[PDB]
A and B are shown apart, each in its own frame.
With several copies, the nearest count.
Chain A
């Protein structure tokens, strides 16, 4: 059973990878090695970008796979079986997609809460820290998952702040308040 199913298309692949590596026991190893080969795929720019797009054979695809396992002899065998799956399904256009998804499952398994505090401008580090403290203090943190605080800059969200994490947000942006004030003052 995965740590909560997420993603259907491509994520059945990710789920499978997760549960299979749960039966491998080593999920972290798998993820780390996948991360490393994925990174060198991205840092292979000629045909590691320009042949991420299927247009070539099953057999040619297989030989690309063979080149990939020459690039790293550490990739476990489950993620080498994942290479087999992707070659067989001839879908390379969702390799990094699967990588991202496996990251989500993996860090859910690790248990790290995710969040973002989108604002109009990058906030103070004191603000960051106070918010980090607050979020950990709040019942939202289960003490089992540790927030990510990602500042996003969104001037379109004119002033204020919006805190986001879980399915729970508090939006005390200036834009929303102005919007509501204006709207009701058009009534």
Chain B
């Protein structure tokens, strides 16, 4: 496939000059093989003159202007499956849980177009939740957006855990706890807690799949973490 040489590294905005006429499309994912494994850059402009402008998903520290870039060909494709249940995956869709390569069926682009007007369901329903207070005074709704308020550690986390338990009874569904710029110390605790409360059973089954965003991750990867989770 097409290859191109890095022609700028101003901040985390890395401009790559690609061989003529055959240029990535907007929202493609590029992989620069690095001694850090790979660096995933996502094409967010065409600057013209067979050059693009991309954002980075991994830190750009060290990079010789002129390193080869390879174009994956589309938005990052992250594995999905019942396999991905109970797996911590970083933004580039790779296991960071260190439970080794996640066996994948299919992988899917992180950017996706919202369902059509036709595909929208025309009547809303009520999602059951075990908490009586919730089910009386502010019922959960099927496919709704329910916005939590009140700081973490009040039991906020425990409330979230409760919902997973409830979900297992309610549907027997799955969940994905997507953490956007989660405090990484706190994240370790959360993983440990989720293991402990058995919503993740390493040996057993796991309802929740984890996508954890660390504040040390580049801003671009912080931004795309949510979209990745949504794909799952």
Contact = CB atoms under 8 A, between A and B. Distances in A.
Please tell me whether chains A and B touch each other in their complex, using a CB distance cut-off of 8 A.
Answer: yes
Interface of A: 57-59, 90, 156
B101 to A, nearest CB: 34
A156 B22 contact: yes
Contacts of B21: 57
A95 B50 CA distance: 21
A24 B50 CA distance: 35
B121 interface: no
Interface of B: 20-22, 49-50
A57 B50 contact: yes
Contacts of A58: 20, 49-50
Given A57-B21, A156-B22, 4 more contacts: A57-B50, A58-B49, A58-B50, A90-B49
Contacts of B20: 57-59
Nearest to A90: B49
Nearest to B19: A59
B71 to A, nearest CB: 14
A59 B17 CA distance: 14
9 contacts: A57-B20, A57-B21, A57-B50, A58-B20, A58-B49, A58-B50, A59-B20, A90-B49, A156-B22
A156 B22 CA distance: 8
A59 B49 CA distance: 11
A59 B21 CA distance: 10
B119 to A, nearest CB: 16
Contacts of B50: 57-58
Contacts of A57: 20-21, 50
A57 B18 CA distance: 12
B116 to A, nearest CB: 13
Contacts of A156: 22
B74 to A, nearest CB: 15
A156 B24 CA distance: 12
A163 to B, nearest CB: 19
Contacts of A90: 49
A51 B21 CA distance: 19
Closest 3 CB pairs of A and B: A57-B20, A59-B20, A156-B22
A55 to B, nearest CB: 11
Contacts of A59: 20
A88 to B, nearest CB: 12
Contacts of B22: 156
A57 B48 CA distance: 10
